[PDB]
Design a protein around this nucleic acid. Structure first.
Ligand SMILES: [Mg+2]
Ligand SMILES: [Mg+2]
Ligand SMILES: [Mg+2]
Ligand SMILES: [Mg+2]
Ligand code: NA
Length: 151
DNA sequence: CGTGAGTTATGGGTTAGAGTCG
């Protein structure tokens, strides 16, 4: 059906801050969480890879990688934590169930939203005292600020 | 450093137009 093809990395080493000034950080080895940080060196740094679709998608599709690693952000289902998936190289071709690696990246001003290609009404979301999850919206926080050049 | 008339559209350059590329 729909196929996604990797173009290139379009953003290196950025930080995601939610609307509450909380940065995404590593929770353990599997998950991410969010926390208010004084020192942004504890914040995860991300790379963003752009994909084209085989059809005229409305919003650009991206993959999110933890910078200087082989760990890619992967969606599960609603209210479940995103998973860090280890991969030898960035996937050149994505279709079928592997679209859980991909997100539509939309901006509303300075606000950035990442919706699962596998679940287009679910967002990367932070929730107090819990891991970064897929969520439909409030009370979860779904709008992020992108802090660039944070290597 | 990235193709080949496509999703040609774009937040963007990748957007022209078959020819560079090592
Ligand atoms: Mg998580
Ligand atoms: Mg494609
Ligand atoms: Mg997804
Ligand atoms: Mg989001
Ligand atoms: Na489009």
């Amino acid at each position: 059906n729909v196929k996604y093809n990797f173009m290139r990395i379009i953003k290196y080493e950025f930080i995601l801050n939610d609307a509450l000034n909380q940065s995404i950080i590593r929770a353990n080895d599997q998950y991410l969480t969010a926390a208010a940080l004084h020192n942004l060196d504890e914040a995860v740094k991300f790379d963003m890879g752009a994909y084209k679709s085989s059809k005229d998608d409305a919003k650009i599709t991206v993959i999110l990688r933890i910078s200087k690693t082989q760990l890619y952000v992967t969606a599960q289902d609603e209210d479940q934590p995103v998973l860090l998936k280890e991969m030898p190289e960035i996937p050149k071709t994505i279709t079928g169930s592997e679209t859980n690696l991909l997100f539509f990246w939309e901006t509303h001003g300075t606000k950035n939203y990442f919706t699962s290609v596998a679940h287009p009404n679910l967002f990367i979301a932070t929730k107090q005292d819990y891991w970064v999850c897929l969520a439909g919206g409030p009370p979860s926080i779904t709008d992020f600020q992108i802090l660039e050049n944070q290597a």
